[PDB]
């Protein structure tokens, strides 16, 4: 009926989404076999009697991340055709994932996308997870998303991008990889949610109060944002939203769709009983700058649009109590031309907890996705990483030798120049 | 068949329960072989547990308390380090109420009788005697071993000695306390104990 088809491309996409799928299995009471001992329509099909196969595709050019799932505990859970492995790795090139090796996978992958979309009309959208600094995360991501825009006309496209850090990078080719992705991300996606890494390191340092978590604990918290995002489709609520309304909620101009995230509460099970989580307190932690999942300082940022999805046993008026005081506060600066800037939806069912996870059982939760002019910092910083490294044609021959035209890096920057100016033009 | 399949407790459990299942099925719609949910076992037999007064108590005494097994060795330095903090936690947590809250069983990875009694003199909680087969059966059940001596069936070591395992009525691993684990909260992991939702029913 109504559903969303999810795409996982690149390693970062796979193992974030592998956490995202194991959260969804236990949300609807689906065993790893795929059985259950009108909830599960929007992420699962039903096969024969008692089964639930997912609405997903795994794509990677290396086997090593995707085949390891094939032999994991989620053996029978995925149909063995949409798990796709190439032969050799993309190896941190935009060019290689876009020109040479990326071509021979899109020819089979788009077919499976067609095979999954032709059952029921009224597709909600496309949830594609990828990294940006990665090789296959950008190149295969671009080629798949470009083809999808032409083939399927008008339906929405959600894209969670594991954005390169302001501070750490864990690769040298990141400024060359990031810039080139953007020029092919602007006119394809509809809602690009920017996620960071050391923010969640900083989150798990303070709030979670666990000394040494790894990528497996990054992914739980990421999975908790996605569940609360699409909580409205799965379950009834006092005031629900859709995934086709977000683009009408958040974007004022078609080129401005780079939004942040926030989540609360994020508390250890040990320190949980020192906070009875009220609606008055969770909303203020949502707006507190050391709780957002992007790491950009919003003090130099004029807010433009905000979209809060409350979860669990929350009544509508203490939301209205909280938002009254929020607007009158002068630490959270809204822009002049947008005097209304809130959407606040509500769902009934409180968030699940993973067994052996790092999340205590909470009764209410807030998830925030906001459009702000602080992203001018995220981009003007990035442009500086480019031209300083492009000062004397560092690493150029790798891209040149793989297939790209030298000089295409210029209009990619001139594109990002325009995205730099319009944010600064808006904020005045 | 939790937390592993190939454990002596579970092989005894399966044998006994489906013996009973077939008998009553023939005597009578009942699903063979029985679900692990439907199976019932007696975990600690008649003469296993013995307390601080050297008196055997039955299993029904442990109802209403968060019980945890403690795999310990007398001569292991890590266990020698962990012992005072576990004792202090037992002290404070059980003193601070008008209700018994948690209880510890002692399972011995120790070498011999003398050293076992010497180490057991320090503990104010229950213990299982070392010559009792239940010690080795519990070791193989929860996959704790100091060295690859007893074969493991494609599994690994769950942990090393020392370890604290919060258990349930049926041999369910309720939660693992990360003393020497993937997390390494030495002496601090004891605060992770959720005693409210893990009561020995």
């Amino acid at each position: 009926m109504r559903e969303v088809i999810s795409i996982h491309v690149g390693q970062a996409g796979i193992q974030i989404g592998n956490a995202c799928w194991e959260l969804f299995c236990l949300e609807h009471g689906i065993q790893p076999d795929g059985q259950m001992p009108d909830a599960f329509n929007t992420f699962f099909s039903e096969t024969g009697a008692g089964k639930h196969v997912p609405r997903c595709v795994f794509l990677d050019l290396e086997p090593t991340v995707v085949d390891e799932v094939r032999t994991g505990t989620y053996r029978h859970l995925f149909h063995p055709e949409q798990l796709i492995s190439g032969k050799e790795d993309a190896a941190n090139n935009f060019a290689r994932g876009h020109y040479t090796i990326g071509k021979e996978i899109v020819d089979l992958s788009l077919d499976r996308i067609r095979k999954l979309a032709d059952n029921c009309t009224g597709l909600q959208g496309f949830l594609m997870f990828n990294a940006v600094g990665g090789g296959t995360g950008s190149g295969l991501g671009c080629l798949l998303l470009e083809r999808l825009s032409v083939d399927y006309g008008k339906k929405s496209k959600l894209n969670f991008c594991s954005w390169p850090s302001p501070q750490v990078s864990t690769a040298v080719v990141e400024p060359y990889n990031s810039v080139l992705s953007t020029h092919s991300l602007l006119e394809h996606t509809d809602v690009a949610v920017m996620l960071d890494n050391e923010a969640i390191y900083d989150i798990c340092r303070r709030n979670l109060d666990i000394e040494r978590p790894t990528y497996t604990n990054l992914n739980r918290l990421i999975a908790q944002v996605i569940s609360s995002l699409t909580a409205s489709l799965r379950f009834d609520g006092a005031l629900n939203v859709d995934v086709t309304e977000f683009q009408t909620n958040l974007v004022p101009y078609p080129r401005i769709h780079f939004m942040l995230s926030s989540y609360a509460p994020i508390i250890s099970a040990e320190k949980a009983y020192h906070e009875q989580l009220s609606v008055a307190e969770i909303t203020n932690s949502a707006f507190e700058p050391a709780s957002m999942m992007a790491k950009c300082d919003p003090r130099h940022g004029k807010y433009m649009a905000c979209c809060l999805m409350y979860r669990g046993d929350v009544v509508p008026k203490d939301v209205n109590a909280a938002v009254a005081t929020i607007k009158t506060k002068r630490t959270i600066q809204f822009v002049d031309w947008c005097p209304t800037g809130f959407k606040c939806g509500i769902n009934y069912q409180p968030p699940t907890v993973v067994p052996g996870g790092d999340l205590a059982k909470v009764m209410r939760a807030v998830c925030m996705i906001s459009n702000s002019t602080a992203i001018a910092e995220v981009f003007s910083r990035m442009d500086h990483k480019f031209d300083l490294m492009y000062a004397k044609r560092a690493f150029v021959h790798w891209y040149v030798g793989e297939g790209m035209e030298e000089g295409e890096f210029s209009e990619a920057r001139e594109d990002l120049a325009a995205l730099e100016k319009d944010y600064e033009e808006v904020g005045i | 068949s939790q937390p592993v399949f190939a454990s002596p407790l579970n092989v005894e459990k399966r044998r006994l329960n489906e013996e009973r299942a077939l008998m009553q099925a023939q005597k009578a719609n009942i699903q063979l072989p029985p679900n692990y949910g439907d199976m019932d076992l007696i975990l600690f037999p008649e003469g296993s547990l013995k307390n601080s007064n050297n008196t055997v108590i039955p299993q029904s005494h442990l109802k209403g308390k968060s019980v945890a097994l403690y795999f310990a060795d007398g001569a292991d330095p890590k266990c020698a380090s962990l012992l005072p903090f576990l004792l202090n936690y037992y002290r404070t947590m059980n003193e601070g109420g008008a209700n018994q809250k948690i209880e510890i069983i002692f399972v011995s990875l120790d070498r011999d009788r003398e050293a076992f009694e010497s180490h057991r003199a320090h503990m104010p909680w229950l213990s299982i005697d070392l010559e009792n087969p239940l010690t080795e059966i519990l070791k193989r059940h929860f996959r704790v071993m100091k060295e690859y001596e007893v074969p493991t069936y494609g599994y690994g070591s769950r942990t090393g000695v020392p370890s604290v395992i919060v258990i349930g009525s049926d041999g369910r691993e309720a939660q693992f306390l990360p003393i020497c684990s993937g997390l390494e909260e030495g002496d601090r992991a004891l605060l992770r104990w959720d005693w409210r939702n893990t009561k020995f029913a």
């Binding site: 001992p37 390891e68 497996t216 | -």
Partner: peptide
Amino acid sequence: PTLPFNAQSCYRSEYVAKPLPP
């Protein structure tokens, strides 16, 4: 010639058979 290696991946460790919601 080896006696067996018994450290285990984080993925295998923790995404295990949870008790199901109905």
